[PDB]
Each structure stands twice: as C-alpha cells, then as structure tokens.
Amino acid sequence: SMEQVAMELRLTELTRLLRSVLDQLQDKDPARIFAQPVSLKEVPDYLDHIKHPMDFATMRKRLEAQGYKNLHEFEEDFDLIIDNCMKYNARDTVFYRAAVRLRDQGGVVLRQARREVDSIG
C-alpha cells in the first residue's frame, strides 16, 4: 500500500537524522572508550555485572537495519552506554569520568534532536 510506503519513508528519514545524532555523540568520545563492545575475553565477569551491554558499534548496526522506530529507543541505548560504565567502573577512573563527560555533552545534542523529530514529524 501507499500508506506502508509513506511510513517507510518516515522511518528512513528518522534513520538519517539518528545517524547524524550518532556521529555528533561519538565525537564527544575522542578517546574511543565507547566505540566497541566490552570484550568478554578481557572482562570475563562483565555479564555478572552488566545485563544489557551497549556500545556505539552495536548502535550503528541497529541504526543501519533501521531498527530504531523512535528517538526514545535510540536514547535508551545511549543511556545504557553511560549507565553501564558508571556502574562497572569507580568514580575515580578514566572510564567513569569519560561517561560523565559524554552524558553532559550528549545532553545538548539530544535536546535539539528531540525538537527536530517533533518539528519535522
């Protein structure tokens, strides 16, 4: 149906805007701390601590399969990246501090993306 097509065009356009959001968030991580999944070879206990691991490469796979139907879903995954790091790592560590900084800087980007998603539809 033409209705199905129009929905798919809207998903496609949301995906374009989320890719640009993703690029902007990831620039706030020049160290690349959050770029790839935590290795279970190198942190064998990780899944005893963290139940839903997340990272930017995994978000990017989901994005390119148009797997985010709304900005809320995409935000949940971004928040997992931050929140998981702040639980696993102590306050005095470069990892925890990197997460705080990403959260603070990411807030700005996400504030405007919510306006743009509402504004365009």
Q: Is the dihedral of CA 79, 38, 93, 109 positive or negative?
A: negative
Quote the Cα angle for 1-7-19, to 5°: 145
Three-state DSSP state, 116: helix
26 HSE (CA, 13 A, CB side): 16
Residue 36 phi, psi (nearest 5) = -135, 160
Dig out the tokens for 10 from the structure: 């809207």
Q: Where are the alpha helices (DSSP H) in 1-121?
A: 2-27, 46-49, 56-64, 71-88, 94-120
Give CA angle at 69 (51, 88), nearest 5°. Answer: 20
Instruction: For Cα atoms 52, 62, 112, give the angle at the middle one, nearest 5 degrees.
Output: 95
Experimental method: X-ray
| CA torsion, ordered 87, 93, 96, 97, to nearest 10 deg | 160
Instruction: Write down the CATH number for the domain with range 1-121.
Output: 1.20.920.10
**Resolution of this entry, Å:** 1.9
